[PDB]
Each structure stands twice: as structure tokens, then as C-alpha cells.
RNA sequence: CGUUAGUUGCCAGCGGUUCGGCCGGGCACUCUAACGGGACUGCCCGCGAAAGCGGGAGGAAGGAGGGGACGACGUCUGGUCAGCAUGGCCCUUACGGCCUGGGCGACACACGUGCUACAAUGCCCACUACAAAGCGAUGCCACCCGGCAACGGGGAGCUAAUCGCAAAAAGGUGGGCCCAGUUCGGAUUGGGGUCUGCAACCCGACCCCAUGAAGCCGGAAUCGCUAGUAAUCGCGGAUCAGCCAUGCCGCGG
């Protein structure tokens, strides 16, 4: 009937709701492309469906909030892959070598006192 | 650039409002 | 409508405080909504470590105000009965609005 | 600083603008956090003493 | 110039604030002020009684100040004589109509501020500092106290050159915030100048 | 680019002084430490010693200079 | 296409062409294109002598312009210089007026660097 | 890298050609973290090169890169006073980085107005054997075989 | 990842719709904030005497997962008696004390640290989209009205997961500029004006008109960063009536 995955990337959440359907994707009440498309990496979000050739099998309804649209895209990749695993757990061994089901834990490094931006040190002369 | 106070971006650089950057 | 605003610097004083309230109101009232936690207001202060510079050595402290909501639904007496003055905690602070 | 310069305590400033912070514990003129009424130094000393409730060691 | 304050380090775990209450933007300033005046006047009048910690709690306009003293007898007085004089003197300063509590301290040699104070007292009367120091570390060590350390600052023995003294015993691991190290500071004022007296005591593990 | 927006400010010390000096005729040098103040047209013709911090400088106030403030004619610094 | 005191912007957009006039910036150019009902985007070369004559009408006598402007600003300086005004002293010694710092970075107002020994 | 080998970063395959070399090239075009801009530059340039010439832009990208790859370069080595320019071979990894970098830095020295125009045209020239990139490669290969007399300093 | 908890969340689900989570209502999800679980070279192959090293599966994550807080005996006669404390020496119609004014803002020069740029991977204009973290009771100020605007009047809400700062900016679509000291660049200067403040000459910020400088990627030399890093983009706060903040301390794209 319906399958779900959460997914998360860099301070952003995107709930992925998969249902068997035509293959048309909805995000935040806008067409997938009306949200994206001006952004080249957009299609990467859907890479989980191309690995298992689940293109025309599922429609999806997404809820994306937090961060910027790139991290949103990755969150969508993860959500699609999580639902896609709950649908058929036999997809795990197919989706794992690609690492679409792995969370990207890299986040903005904290600004540290004494430095300009958490790594970049203020320049000096010695004379 | 961000230095021209009568451009939109110079306004947002100073965090100010005027003719070249209204509010709504 | 009975709102109970719970605020404190210690997060264990707020919990040890709210739990007694719910245990006093569950013996009488309806199913209390719950100890719904509200987000934490964090005031930070950054200070240069020494006097008379060595600017680049500052250490910062943070004071964190924690907030909790209670919301007893339809209490009459045996709720307010155990609620007159029975609480132990000190650093907690409570407001009531109707 | 000087005792006389704590005339701010007795302000009656004759103009509202001549009121300044003046850390109470040490009489510091310059850098005085307004929420504690102390200066940065006295704030550090009283925070390390533990006499400032809720004030922890910031870490993240 | 290293080694930040141990009590300031441990405020989170294995140390509790000397002031525990709640306040807002409009309140905290003068409540903290009041706490400071309290600790001030108490440190004045009770130094001979050997006070270590003053705890200030507030629920609503009530003040639950608890003084921790080596000899509660000096505090109370004969049949409650001094605890009248100065406890009324307290509510004269702050109109809080504030109450007061007294608590004994077992083994005054085990409370770091008290140890520091005792050593500084010995210094103001000009005793041999290494003896006072090692002796104090014995008084601490001879009762519980899995660790102990005592530091005395410059101008030792009135010497022209400032010096720094020593002789911890046991184990005093400031770097680990596990095992409830106690700290106390004392100040010996003398003709040759000022002398800092630091007292570390190490008790308990988890 | 200069702005007081309304009620053009002039200190009351010399105001009540110069206006009364008008009724009795043009007077001689006057003493002023208040350069905070603007100039008004009824000062024209007088002679006002303004303070720079060190000395009193005599200033002949003319028609063309009514808009400025005292001390625009009594500079502070001394260079070369 | 001469509009103001002799001024011949050419081959460009009229609104930007007018900038080449002394008393006209982007604001006064967009205004004169506005109230004269001329498409600002037209090439100067494509301008009707009717539109041109209207532009000369508006611009020539609405605001004081190139010559009278240069003169009026000069006389405005000599105004505060002839009087003992402080601003006048700053204009005399070739120093910043607006209350800038002179200890460094006075380069625009004064005599690009003329170095001495030490 | 004093301790370890400092393993090479593994780039993500190209969203369009599924090819990693393309992604790296986009990375060298990208400035101030604008990868969307850089990608639109590169792909619009793929339209240019695929139209003005009727061949697949993929094969031309690879060929253009391949003709800029230097097989030998020169490196200074401090020997008995003033150092020497010493020829030696070029790591395949280093051939990669140098060829892409040279391609981009050359394309931006072109007279063409828009970015993707320069990218396309430099790609075509370099694939035909001409163009500034192939001249940096030919000049570096001239640095070797000229100081060839120091082929015993290989290190 | 789970437990507790549901006035941030939700046609996942149905009910109503002024199609706005608005209502009904529900806690599943997102989240908020407290307690927990989890990773241990525990498993496989290989090497090894061992510690350990290499590789692999499972796993969100592995060999210190990433970032903090944390800086030993001591060194430098390091830094500060001008934050505080303080020995000694001096001053006491005065080195003290009050005020007004000026100075700490001086300019023939030199270095440090930064900002904005010299442009087309750009500039401008319209439209439109996605953050985290903080601050606010005479303060934050939606919204109406006047004003090109700074702003003024009026005036709602918010003791603030419920109100407001608020618009994020780069970006996306559309359009203009066409390689030019310019639709680059915003210094300098005239002129007009808002605001805070008793008061803006010395000496403030801000707005509008006009002026539109140097500068077309920088000599010898020299600095930063090894991954959400550099680079770049905006946002917030501390002090403070205001502000010379391009600083600093944080935040995320
Ligand atoms: Mg279902
Ligand atoms: Mg950043
Ligand atoms: Mg962070
Ligand atoms: Mg501009
Ligand atoms: Mg500093
Ligand atoms: Mg003093
Ligand atoms: Mg002030
Ligand atoms: Mg504890
Ligand atoms: Mg001695
Ligand atoms: Mg401990
Ligand atoms: Mg344990
Ligand atoms: Mg969870
Ligand atoms: Mg809620
Ligand atoms: Mg939903
Ligand atoms: Mg073996
Ligand atoms: Mg391994
Ligand atoms: Mg492995
Ligand atoms: Mg691993
Ligand atoms: Mg660690
Ligand atoms: Mg760790
Ligand atoms: Mg450690
Ligand atoms: Mg010295
Ligand atoms: Mg020293
Ligand atoms: Mg200075
Ligand atoms: Mg209007
Ligand atoms: Mg809400
Ligand atoms: Mg709420
Ligand atoms: Mg609430
Ligand atoms: Mg365009
Ligand atoms: Mg221009
Ligand atoms: Mg030039
Ligand atoms: Mg140019
Ligand atoms: Mg490193
Ligand atoms: Mg401010
Ligand atoms: Mg200034
Ligand atoms: Mg700022
Ligand atoms: Zn202080």
C-alpha cells in the first residue's frame, strides 16, 4: 500500500512517502521539478529508484524542511532508499554497495574563539 | 558592489533600508 | 484551562518538580496531557580569560533556562488537594494561568 | 578604579546620558556585562567560585 | 599560566553551586548582589568560627541561607546570643525577613577552604612554611583523603625573591573530572606582603 | 548634511544675554564656553570670544555666517 | 543629440546616456525619461527630434546644470572659505571635511603619498 | 603527508555522463563554492561543442584532456649550492590534475565572451592538438629533454 | 535507534473548508528535551611471540566517527600594582575633589590588521524558493496612513515552540548592460533632510539629489587552510540612548 523513510542530511529532514503509482513526484505541494530544476544535482535524489529500476513503479509524496536545498536533495535520496528497503528488505543487499542508505554525518564545523572561521587563522607579520 | 549604499546589495550589507531597498 | 509554566536553571529540579505534580494530579483528575518539554533558552557569555590582553584566549559560559508544560485537563479538588504546598524543590519556579 | 568615580552610584546624573555601567564588585569602568551587573573579570571569578546559579562551562 | 579553577571546572558534576535559585532578566542582577553582600558580611563576622561554605537558596522572597562552620558553638553563642544579633543585622540590610541555618563540618581538616585558612593563619604568624605545608597534608592525609596538595606563593619566609612551595601527597588528578576534588583559597597578609594559599583535597571516585 | 530637524538649538546662557544686549545697543566682546549652540540672525554685528579649550578668541559675527555654530570659527587644534 | 549645455551622448541607452551630463545621475535620468514619456531603452541614435526637443525642454531648465552647477559649487566653497569657517580651513589645507581620520588613508583628499625620512 | 599515503579523494560520478573525470573538471571550474554555476557552464559548453561539431562531446572531452597530459616535467633539487631543474616522469594522478587545471586556466585566457564559449572552444582546440593548454604541455615537455643532462639526479 | 511526553507537528487518515493546520481531531511522523541503547579489533581471512597492522562482512557509524571543554615538573626576572587585592616609597588647599570646555579623532610620513574592489563564473532590475542560532516589557514592534526614503503618526499582538525582529544572501526563472575607467568601482565633495541625545564645530549614524577618485589582479617579500576544511554567502548577539562594528564572539547556506 504505502512505505516510508525519513532520511537526513546536514540539518534537514525530508519525509519520503512511497506508493505504487505512475512515477510522478510531489514535494511540498509543488511539482518535483518546480521545486528543483535550476539545480543540476536534483536528479541525484532519485538515484535509489534507478538502482533497483523502480522508476515507473512508485509515486512519492515528500515533506522537506530545514537546511538548504542540496542537503534536502540528499535527505530525499536517503528517504527514498529507506522506504525502498522497508518495501522489500531484499533491496538492502542491492542498495548497500552504493551506500545510498548511509547517513552523511558531516556538519558545519563550529566557530572557535581565536580563529576567524573555525579553522582559518588571522594572518601575522613578525615584523 | 556591497560598498555602493544606493544599490540593493550595499543596503543589505549595511543592513539598512531606503529607496533602493524597501521593506514590503 | 489550567496552564502551569515550569522554568528552572537545573533540568533535574524541573523533572523532580513536575513528576510530583503529575503523581498528585493523576490520582484525581483526567488523564493529564503530559510533561510536554519546551525548548531551552541559552544565554551565552564570552569573556577574555585574563585581564590586560591576551585577547585570543577567551572562555565562554552558558546559562540555560529549561521550560516545561503540564496542562491538567478537568481537575476539581482532589487534584488541588495535594497541590497546596507539598513540593520540595528550590531552584524551580512555577507560574499559573487560567 | 577610584572611589570618587563611583559617583555613578549616587547618579542624579543631571542628564540621562551620563549614566554608565560601573561593575559593582570591583568598580570596573570599562567592560561591564549588564545582566550580572559585574565586569568580565568579576564575572569569571564568581562563575568559577560557583556563586552564579545556572552558569556552566560552555561546551559544544 | 595554565590550570583553570577546579571548582569552576566541576560546577556541572561533583560540585553544586553556592547559590541555587531562579531569576529573569530583571531579577538576577540584584539577587546576585544580595548573595554577595551576604557572603561578605558572613566572611567578616564568622572568620574566627571557621566558615567554609555559605549556601544561598531562594524559592520566593524567602532566603534559606545555610552556613557551614567548623565550630557551630561560636556561631550560636551562649544559648543563642550571637545568632540573634547578627541574624537581625542580616534582615536589616536586605528587607527579605530572611532566616538562617547552621551546619557542623566533621573534620575541618577535610574541607579545602578550611585547610587553606589554617595554613594562611600559620603564615601570618610566621611559621616555617614547609612544615606548615607538609603538616597540613598530614592532617588531611591522616583522615580519609585519598589525595591532598598544598601550594604557597611567593615571598616565602619574607624572602626578597618570590618562591613557590609544594609537597602534595596521595593523588590529586585535576585533569579528570570524576572524583570530587575540593579546593580552597586563603590569603595571608604580612609586613613583607601578600601570600596566596591553595588547598586541594581528593576524596571519593564516582 | 547637517540636521537638527526642528527647534534649532541655542544654549540659554548667551541667548538671554545677547537679546538683552540688543535693547541697550551693541556691546563689546562677550564670554562664551557654549559652542554647542547654533547662530541666530540677531547675533549679527556682535563680537563673541569663543573658547577652544585654551583661550578666548574674538569672533565678529556677520550676516553670511548665521547658519553655522560657534566654534566653527574657533578651532581647537594647532598644527605647523 | 545635444540636450543640455553642449552634451552629445551617442549610440547608447538614453537613460544611461544622460549620465554623461554633469547635473544628471541615474535618478534624474529615469525621471526625465519618465515625465517626458520616452522609452528609456531606445538607442540615442534612434531618437525622434520631437522626443529630443522635449528632453531638452525638461532637462535644460528644471535643475541647474553643468556650467551653473560647477560655478555654484565653486562659489559654495569660496563661501565657507572667505568666512573663517572650519570647513573652510579643511578646504584650504586640502584635508578631508566630513570628519574623517587623517593619520592614515587621507590619500584621496590629499596629495598621493609624499614620503620623508625617519 | 608525513605519516600516511594521503589517499586520493573519490569523486562522485557525473550526474549526466556517470563519469568521474567530468565531475573533477566541473570542480576545477567551480569558484567560491558555486557548483551549480560551474555545472551549467560545463553543460552549456557541451551543447556548443556538440553543435558546432557533429561529434559526441564526451569523446572530445576525453581526447582534449588526453592531449594535454604531460609525460615528463622538471623539478628543482638542491645540489651543492644553487639547485637544478631536474626532469622526471609525471604520475598518472599528476597528469590528471595538471591536464584539467591547464585546460581551465587556458580557457579563461581565451578572447571569447561567455564562459561556456571559452570552455567549448578550448576543448575543441586542445582535442585537435592546438590551443593554449597543449602549449603549456608542450613547453613543460620542452623543459625535460633540455635539462636531460641531469637525468642522473632522478630521485 | 528506542522509552516517556504531547496546543512546533499532520488529508500519513478520514470529517468540515472563508482551501490558511483554518476547524474537528490524532500523535504516527518532523520536532522539542530528559533518560537510555549503540562500537568493543566483539566477528572472518592474513601477518605476528605479544601488543598490534592490513583487508573484509554486518552496521547510521570502526580502529581516536567528527568538534569542543581539558594544558604536566617547569621556562621566559614574560603580562598586568590601570580590573581587584597588595609591601614599600611619595602626594596631601595638594598628584586629591567638582564643573564647563578642549584632548584621547591631531598629519609631511612608515608598518600591522581588516573592509570594498578593479568585473561578463560579472553588475543591475523584477519575481520567487530553502537555514540554523539568538535577542525583545517601554522593549520587539506585525498592520494602516503620510513621506522617493531615512522616518513620523496611529495602532494589533507578544511576560513570547504560540507575537515580533524577518527580508535570509548567494540560488532559481525573466529581462537589461556588451568589454568600455563602463550600468565595473563608491573614495571625495556640494546641497537638502530623519533620528538618538541637554547638546552633533571640533566629533555620530542614516536617507535623498548631484559629484563618480584611485583602482584593469598587485615589486622584493609574505599568510591561511588537509573535509563541511579552504573559498564564498548572508543571519544573530555581547557592550550600547546613539554610533564611527569592515572588529569580536557565535550560526547556518
Ligand atoms: Mg496506512
Ligand atoms: Mg561557514
Ligand atoms: Mg556546528
Ligand atoms: Mg554600482
Ligand atoms: Mg581580544
Ligand atoms: Mg585603588
Ligand atoms: Mg553611556
Ligand atoms: Mg551533583
Ligand atoms: Mg617560612
Ligand atoms: Mg573530581
Ligand atoms: Mg563507571
Ligand atoms: Mg528517534
Ligand atoms: Mg506542542
Ligand atoms: Mg502529511
Ligand atoms: Mg601466529
Ligand atoms: Mg579493519
Ligand atoms: Mg570494514
Ligand atoms: Mg570501519
Ligand atoms: Mg575526544
Ligand atoms: Mg568522541
Ligand atoms: Mg585528558
Ligand atoms: Mg620586566
Ligand atoms: Mg613575572
Ligand atoms: Mg586610541
Ligand atoms: Mg507608501
Ligand atoms: Mg504554535
Ligand atoms: Mg506553544
Ligand atoms: Mg507556550
Ligand atoms: Mg540573465
Ligand atoms: Mg560609473
Ligand atoms: Mg586610473
Ligand atoms: Mg576592464
Ligand atoms: Mg591538520
Ligand atoms: Mg547596538
Ligand atoms: Mg568616522
Ligand atoms: Mg554587525
Ligand atoms: Zn569587576
List keywords for this structure.
8 chains, E: 206 residues, GMP Synthetase, Chain A, domain 3, 2 domains, four-stranded antiparallel β-sheet, G: 118 residues, mainly alpha, Helicase, Ruva Protein, domain 3, 30s ribosomal protein s13, domain 2, binds magnesium ion, binds zinc ion, RNA-binding, rRNA-binding (chain D), metal-binding (chain D), Ribosomal_uS14 (chain D)
Describe this entry's structure for a reader.
The structure is cut from a larger assembly and holds eight protein chains of eight kinds. With 127 residues, chain A is an alpha+beta fold. Chain A has one domain: Ribosomal Protein S5, domain 2 (2-Layer Sandwich), CATH 3.30.230. Helix content of chain A is 25%, strand content 19%. Chain A contains four helices and five strands; from the N terminus they run ββββααβαα. Chain B has 24 residues and is mainly alpha-helical. Helices cover 29% and strands 0% of the residues of chain B. Chain B is globular, with a radius of gyration of 7 Å. Chain C has one domain: Ribosomal protein S10 (Alpha-Beta Plaits, 2-Layer Sandwich). Chain C has a four-stranded antiparallel beta sheet with strand order 2-3-1-4. The N and C termini of chain C lie close together (5 Å). Chain F contains one helix and three strands, in the order αβββ. In chain F, strands 1-2-3 form a three-stranded mixed beta sheet, with no helix packed on it. The radius of gyration of chain F is 13 Å and the shape is globular. Classes of the chains: A alpha+beta (127), B mainly alpha (24), C alpha+beta (98), D mainly alpha (60), E alpha/beta (206), F alpha+beta (80), G mainly alpha (118), H mainly alpha (155). Chains in contact: A-C, A-H, C-D, C-E, D-E, F-G. β3 of chain C pairs antiparallel with β1 of chain D. One magnesium ion binds next to loops of chain B. The structure holds one RNA strand of 253 nucleotides. Chain C: GO terms for molecular function: rRNA binding; structural constituent of ribosome; tRNA binding. Chain C: Keywords: Ribonucleoprotein, Ribosomal protein, RNA-binding, rRNA-binding. Chain C: One of its GO terms (cellular component) is ribonucleoprotein complex. Chain C: One of its GO terms (biological process) is translation. Chain C: Involved in the binding of tRNA to the ribosomes. Part of the top of the 30S subunit head.
Quick gist of this model?
Helix content of chain A is 25%, strand content 19%.
**What count of structural domains of chain F?**
1
Say what the CATH topology of chain F is.
30s Ribosomal Protein S19, Chain A
The dominant shape of chain C is: elongated
Helix count of chain C equals 2
Q: Largest sheet of chain C, described in full? A: 4 strands, antiparallel
Radius of gyration of chain C: 19 Å
Main sheet summary of chain F: 3 strands, mixed
Question: What percent of residues of chain F are in strands?
Answer: 15-25%
Shape of chain F: globular
CATH architecture of chain F: 2-Layer Sandwich
Which class of chain F in CATH terms? Alpha Beta
Which class best fits the helix and strand makeup of chain F?
A: alpha+beta
Bound ions, cofactors and other small molecules, one mention each: magnesium ion, zinc ion
Amino acid at each position: 500500500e504505502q512505505y516510508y523513510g525519513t532520511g537526513r542530511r546536514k540539518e534537514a529532514v525530508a519525509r519520503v512517502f512511497l506508493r505504487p503509482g505512475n512515477g510522478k513526484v510531489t514535494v511540498n505541494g509543488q511539482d518535483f521539478n518546480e521545486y528543483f530544476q535550476g539545480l543540476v544535482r536534483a536528479v541525484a535524489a532519485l538515484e535509489p529508484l534507478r538502482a533497483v529500476d523502480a522508476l515507473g513503479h512508485f509515486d512519492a509524496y515528500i515533506t522537506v524542511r530545514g537546511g538548504g536545498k542540496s542537503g534536502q536533495i540528499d535527505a530525499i535520496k536517503l528517504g527514498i532508499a529507506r522506504a525502498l528497503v522497508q518495501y522489500n528488505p531484499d533491496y538492502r543487499a542491492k542498495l548497500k554497495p552504493l551506500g545510498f542508505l548511509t547517513r552523511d554525518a558531516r556538519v558545519v564545523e563550529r566557530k572557535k574563539y581565536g580563529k576567524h572561521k573555525a579553522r582559518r587563522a588571522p594572518q601575522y607579520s613578525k615584523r | 558592489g556591497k560598498g555602493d549604499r544606493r544599490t540593493r546589495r550595499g543596503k543589505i550589507w549595511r543592513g539598512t533600508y531606503g529607496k533602493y531597498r524597501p521593506r514590503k | 484551562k489550567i496552564r502551569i509554566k515550569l522554568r528552572g536553571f537545573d533540568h533535574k529540579t524541573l523533572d523532580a518538580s513536575a513528576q510530583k505534580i503529575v503523581e498528585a494530579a493523576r490520582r484525581s483528575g483526567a488523564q493529564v496531557s503530559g510533561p510536554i518539554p519546551l525548548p531551552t533558552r541559552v544565554r551565552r557569555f564570552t569573556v577574555i580569560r585574563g585581564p590586560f590582553k591576551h585577547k585570543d584566549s577567551r572562555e565562554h559560559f552558558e546559562l540555560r533556562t529549561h521550560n516545561r508544560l503540564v496542562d491538567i485537563i478537568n481537575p476539581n479538588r482532589k487534584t488541588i488537594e495535594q497541590l497546596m504546598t507539598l513540593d520540595l524543590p528550590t531552584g524551580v519556579e512555577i507560574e499559573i494561568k487560567t | 578604579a577610584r572611589k570618587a568615580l563611583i559617583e555613578k552610584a549616587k547618579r542624579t546624573p543631571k542628564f540621562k546620558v551620563r549614566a554608565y555601567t560601573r561593575c559593582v564588585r570591583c568598580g570596573r569602568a570599562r567592560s561591564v556585562y549588564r545582566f550580572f551587573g559585574l565586569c568580565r573579570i568579576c564575572l569569571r571569578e564568581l562563575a568559577h567560585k560557583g556563586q552564579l546559579p545556572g552558569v556552566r562551562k560552555a561546551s559544544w | 599560566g595554565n590550570k583553570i579553577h577546579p571548582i569552576g571546572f566541576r560546577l556541572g558534576i561533583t560540585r553544586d553551586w553556592e547559590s541555587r535559585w531562579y531569576a529573569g532578566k530583571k531579577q538576577y542582577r540584584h539577587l546576585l548582589l544580595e548573595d554577595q553582600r551576604i557572603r561578605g558580611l558572613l566572611e567578616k563576622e564568622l572568620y574566627s568560627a571557621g566558615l567554609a561554605r555559605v549556601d544561598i537558596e531562594r524559592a520566593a522572597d524567602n532566603v534559606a541561607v545555610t552556613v557551614h562552620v567548623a565550630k557551630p558553638g561560636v556561631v550560636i553563642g551562649r544559648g543563642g546570643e550571637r545568632i540573634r544579633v547578627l541574624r537581625e543585622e542580616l534582615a536589616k540590610l536586605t528587607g527579605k525577613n530572611v532566616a538562617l541555618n547552621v551546619q557542623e563540618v566533621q573534620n575541618p581538616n577535610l574541607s579545602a577552604p578550611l585547610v587553606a585558612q589554617r595554613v594562611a593563619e600559620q603564615i601570618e604568624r610566621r611559621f616555617a612554611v614547609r612544615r606548615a605545608i607538609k603538616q597540613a597534608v598530614q592532617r588531611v592525609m591522616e583522615s580519609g583523603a585519598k589525595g591532598a596538595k598544598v601550594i604557597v606563593s611567593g615571598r616565602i619566609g619574607g624572602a626578597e625573591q618570590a618562591r613557590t612551595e609544594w609537597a602534595a601527597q596521595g593523588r590529586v588528578p585535576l585533569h579528570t573530572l570524576r572524583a570530587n576534588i575540593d579546593y580552597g583559597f586563603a590569603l595571608a597578609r604580612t609586613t613583607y606582603g601578600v601570600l596566596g594559599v591553595k588547598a586541594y583535597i581528593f576524596l571519593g571516585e564516582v | 548634511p547637517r540636521s537638527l530637524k526642528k527647534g534649532v538649538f541655542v544654549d540659554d546662557h548667551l541667548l538671554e544675554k545677547v537679546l538683552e544686549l540688543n535693547a541697550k545697543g551693541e556691546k563689546r566682546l562677550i564670554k562664551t564656553w557654549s559652542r554647542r549652540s547654533t547662530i541666530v540672525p540677531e547675533m549679527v554685528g556682535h563680537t563673541i570670544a569663543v573658547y577652544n579649550g585654551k583661550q578666548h578668541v574674538p569672533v565678529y559675527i556677520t550676516e553670511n555666517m548665521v547658519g553655522h555654530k560657534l566654534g566653527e570659527f574657533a578651532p581647537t587644534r594647532t598644527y605647523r | 543629440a545635444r540636450i543640455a549645455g553642449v552634451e552629445i551622448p551617442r549610440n547608447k541607452r538614453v537613460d544611461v546616456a544622460l549620465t554623461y551630463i554633469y547635473g544628471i545621475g541615474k535618478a534624474r535620468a529615469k525621471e526625465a525619461l519618465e515625465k517626458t514619456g520616452i522609452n528609456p531603452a531606445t538607442r540615442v541614435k534612434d531618437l525622434t527630434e520631437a522626443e529630443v526637443v522635449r528632453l531638452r525642454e525638461y532637462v535644460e531648465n528644471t535643475w541647474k546644470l553643468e556650467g551653473e552647477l560647477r560655478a555654484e559649487v565653486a562659489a559654495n566653497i569660496k563661501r565657507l572659505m572667505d568666512i573663517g569657517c572650519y570647513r573652510g580651513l579643511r578646504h584650504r589645507r586640502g584635508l578631508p571635511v566630513r570628519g574623517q581620520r587623517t593619520r592614515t588613508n587621507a590619500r584621496t583628499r590629499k596629495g598621493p603619498r609624499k614620503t620623508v625620512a625617519g | 603527508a608525513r605519516r600516511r599515503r594521503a589517499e586520493v579523494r573519490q569523486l562522485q560520478p557525473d550526474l549526466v555522463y556517470g563519469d568521474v573525470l567530468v565531475t573533477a573538471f566541473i570542480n576545477k571550474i567551480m569558484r567560491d563554492g558555486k557548483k551549480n554555476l560551474a555545472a551549467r557552464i560545463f553543460y552549456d559548453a557541451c551543447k556548443i561543442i556538440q553543435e558546432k561539431t557533429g561529434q559526441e562531446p564526451l569523446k572530445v572531452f576525453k581526447q582534449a584532456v588526453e592531449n594535454v597530459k604531460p609525460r615528463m616535467e622538471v623539478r628543482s633539487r638542491r645540489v651543492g649550492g644553487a639547485n637544478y631543474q631536474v626532469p622526471m616522469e609525471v604520475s598518472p594522478r599528476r597528469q590528471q590534475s595538471l591536464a584539467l587545471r591547464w585546460l581551465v586556466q587556458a580557457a579563461n585566457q581565451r578572447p571569447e565572451r561567455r564562459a561556456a564559449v571559452r570552455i567549448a572552444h578550448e576543448l575543441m582546440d586542445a582535442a585537435e592538438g592546438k590551443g593554449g593548454a597543449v602549449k603549456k604541455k608542450e613547453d613543460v615537455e620542452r623543459m625535460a629533454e633540455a635539462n636531460r643532462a641531469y637525468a642522473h639526479y632522478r630521485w
